[PDB]
Amino acid sequence: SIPDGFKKCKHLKNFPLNKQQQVWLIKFPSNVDISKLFESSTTMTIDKHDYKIMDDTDIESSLTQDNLSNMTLLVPSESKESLKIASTAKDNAPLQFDKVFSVSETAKIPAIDYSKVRVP
């Protein structure tokens, strides 16, 4: 409908797509800034914190499979005043990304001191 304290932003920016480019979803926590900067269960170091990179590529594990998902790639049309879907053909079905990733905060429990804990 129309909510109080909400503005319908009628000016968005384009999301191009056309050997060819492939789209991914990446999830990050709110404690990582994204301004500053194929694989499975990778890791990387940022903000002197252990960062886990899990690629929970569901459905697409069994090659292409049926390719039915639970999210859409909403895109701007040639009006840029609303949200629409995009695809590659006349399927009129959502086009899930070519991969997906998740980032999870990681700690490291220090290895227990057997010598100092097994006091006779």
Partner 1 sequence: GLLNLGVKDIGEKVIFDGKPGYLGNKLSVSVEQVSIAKPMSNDAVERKVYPSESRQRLTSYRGKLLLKLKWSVNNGEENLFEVRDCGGLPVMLQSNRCHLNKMSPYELVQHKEESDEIGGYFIVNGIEKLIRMLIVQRRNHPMAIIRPSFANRGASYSHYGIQIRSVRPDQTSQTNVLHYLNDGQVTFRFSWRKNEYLVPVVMILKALCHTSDREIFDGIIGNDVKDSFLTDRLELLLRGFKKRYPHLQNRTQVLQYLGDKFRVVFQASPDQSDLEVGQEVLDRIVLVHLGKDGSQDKFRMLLFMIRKLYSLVAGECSPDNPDATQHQEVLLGGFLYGMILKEKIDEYLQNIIAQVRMDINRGMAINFKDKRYMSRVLMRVNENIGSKMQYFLSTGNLVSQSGLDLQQVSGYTVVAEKINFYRFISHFRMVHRGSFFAQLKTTTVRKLLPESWGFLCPVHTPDGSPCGLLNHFAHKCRISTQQSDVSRIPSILYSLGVAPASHTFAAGPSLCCVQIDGKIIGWVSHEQGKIIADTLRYWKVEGKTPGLPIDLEIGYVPPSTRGQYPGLYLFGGHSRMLRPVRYLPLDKEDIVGPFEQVYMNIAVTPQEIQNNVHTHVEFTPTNILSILANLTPFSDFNQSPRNMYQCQMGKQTMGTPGVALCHRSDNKLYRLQTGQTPIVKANLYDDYGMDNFPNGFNAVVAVISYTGYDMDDAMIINKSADERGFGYGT
Partner 2 sequence: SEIEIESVQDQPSVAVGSFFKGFRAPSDTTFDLYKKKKSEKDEFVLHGENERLEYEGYTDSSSQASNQYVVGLFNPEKKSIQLYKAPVLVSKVVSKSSKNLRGPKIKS
Quote the CA–CA distance of 53 and 26 in Å, as a whole number: 10
Q: What angle do CA 112, 117, 120 make, to 5 degrees?
A: 150
CB closer to partner 2, 37 vs 119: 37
Determine which residue in the list 18, 20, 30, 64 makes contact with partner 1, applying CB under 8 A.
Answer: 30
CB closer to partner 1, 61 vs 79: 61
Burial of 59 (0-12, 13-18, 19+ CB in 10 A): middle
Determine which residue in the list 57, 61, 70, 111 makes contact with partner 2, applying CB under 8 A.
Answer: 70
| Residue written as token pair 């790639």 | 73
Minimal distance in Å, beta carbon 54 to partner 1? 7
Binding mask 19-38 for partner 2 (x = CB under 8 A): xxxxxxxxxxxx---xx-xx
